Every structure is written in structure tokens, then in C-alpha cells.
Amino acid sequence: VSQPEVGAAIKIIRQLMEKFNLDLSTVTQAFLKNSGELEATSAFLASGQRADGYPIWSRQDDIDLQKDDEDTREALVKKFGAQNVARRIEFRK
Amino acid sequence: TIGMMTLKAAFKTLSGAQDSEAAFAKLDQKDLV
């Protein structure tokens, strides 16, 4: 990872920590459950809900995501939507 | 969007603990409450 990418991320993380008065871990973990998306993460930290009408990711969801099973994948698509599922795979790569 | 490894590097940098690697893994492993 490049220094510019880390610097930008550190800036964002620090702003969120001050704006919502949260510790490093809470903010970092929020990003992890929201696949690194700024808007969704900030909306989540502010209201407890993403702005797109879908839930954040859980350990079981991440485990399910790696199952080569059609029924499992359909259940994930219904729970998160095809777009978010695609972004999760990309994020977890 | 902050990539997963970029997020890890940022967390490790800001944390300042030699324990950061394992701590990050725990945040990814545990559900957020």
C-alpha cells in the first residue's frame, strides 16, 4: 500500500474519530463492516444504519460469502443486494 | 473507499502498539456492537 493511500485513510479516520467522538478501534471496525465505504460508514456512525437500506457485514456473512453454494449466495444477495455483495468480495479479496 | 490493507496500515500507524496486527485481526473477526 502506498504512503498517499495510508495518509488519506488516516485523515478520514481521524476526522470521524473527532466528529463522532469515538476511539480508533470503533471507527476502524465500522469501516471493516461497511467494506471501507466513507458515506455508509459515516451514516452508520451517525444513525446506526447505512444510508442504502441494507445491514452491515457480520462474521457469518463473510463466511457465507466464501461458500460455493447457489442457495447461500442468493440469500446474501437478498440480504445485502447484488451491488453490496460484489463490493464485499472485492473488499475481502 | 478505503481498501482493506490500506485500512490495516492506517490502523497500525495510528495505534502505535506492537499488538496492532493481532488487534486488527480481532476487529475483522468480531461483529460490531
Side-chain angles (χ1 to χ4, degrees):
Chain A
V1 296
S2 70
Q3 286 305 82
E5 294 176 300
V6 186
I10 286 175
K11 297 303 88 181
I12 298 174
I13 289 169
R14 297 181 71 184
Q15 300 180 305
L16 294 178
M17 300 188 289
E18 85 124 314
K19 180 182 180 63
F20 297 110
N21 188 49
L22 297 171
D23 64 32
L24 172 63
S25 295
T26 300
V27 179
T28 299
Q29 185 167 46
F31 265 116
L32 281 169
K33 312 308 167 182
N34 288 102
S35 297
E37 291 160 355
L38 177 55
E39 181 183 299
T41 299
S42 50
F44 180 73
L45 295 172
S47 65
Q49 290 300 321
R50 297 181 56 182
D52 67 351
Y54 291 105
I56 63 176
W57 289 75
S58 69
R59 183 59 163 179
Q60 187 60 58
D61 297 310
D62 281 329
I63 286 174
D64 290 344
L65 187 63
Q66 299 309 307
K67 292 178 182 171
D68 185 57
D69 181 59
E70 280 182 51
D71 289 306
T72 298
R73 184 55 65 78
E74 292 301 305
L76 286 175
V77 175
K78 177 157 197 171
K79 178 178 179 176
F80 295 102
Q83 293 295 51
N84 283 329
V85 172
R87 302 169 191 168
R88 191 60 179 176
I89 297 176
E90 174 65 54
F91 184 71
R92 310 290 306 184
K93 68 180 178 57
Chain B
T1 298
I2 303 177
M4 195 164 176
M5 230 68 296
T6 298
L7 187 70
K8 177 176 162 183
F11 173 81
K12 297 184 70 180
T13 303
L14 291 177
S15 169
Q18 106 76 49
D19 200 51
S20 58
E21 186 65 42
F24 184 81
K26 187 179 180 179
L27 298 179
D28 181 49
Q29 179 190 312
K30 301 295 186 173
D31 289 347
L32 180 57
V33 286

